[PDB]
Design a protein around this ligand. Sequence first.
Ligand code: ZN
Length: 257
Amino acid sequence: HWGYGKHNGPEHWHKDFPIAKGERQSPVDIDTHTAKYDPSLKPLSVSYDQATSLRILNNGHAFNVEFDDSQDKAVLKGGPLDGTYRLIQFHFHWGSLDGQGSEHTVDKKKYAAELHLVHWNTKYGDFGKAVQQPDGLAVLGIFLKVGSAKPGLQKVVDVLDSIKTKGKSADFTNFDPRGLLPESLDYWTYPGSLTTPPLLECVTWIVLKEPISVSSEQVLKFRKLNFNGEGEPEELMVDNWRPAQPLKNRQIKASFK
Ligand SMILES: [Zn+2]
């Protein structure tokens, strides 16, 4: 099975998922000087007031905080998007040390981690149908740097001991993802892909310029999770990020001057 090791990591994925070498793969390096301000881009509309979190799952690659996406409760619209995208889950990618962990990079800078809030276009009816469409998903990416604690992250941190190993889940109701946002919704956007297999080219990426700060102690608890299942040889869940892929024939647009 694919993973993040020397034997099954990102440089191997193309053998089972040949789209790994495709024309619109993610993540990418964001060259801030080349990204063009697009005055036609709209403000993001992030409407999370009615978000209903249900569960947190260690899936062996990261942990997902899952939402009720059976109705328009938490939606993303505006920005570069046409129509309405429903929040299904969020997860993170992070490093073994603070100097790596993000998937996107900014002028080759790697952040300690990257949050992905995953949304699907309701015009396709279900997530499985949306991932088959070039405008099926919108992923909001938020960088994490290490400094001050993020108070709105601590409820996530404190449940991780209960989902240490692959295939463990826990009830995770009433979590408000608004506590993970930075102040500014200034963003970069480009067309890309899922950053894990099956690497489908179905994502409009929206990457916020302003990182959030988390504490060293918060990210250290991410790094105590396990890739392995219960009782198996312990493999710390660290460095679960795909490196930047070729930009090819794409433009990164900025919402801001
Ligand atoms: Zn992700």
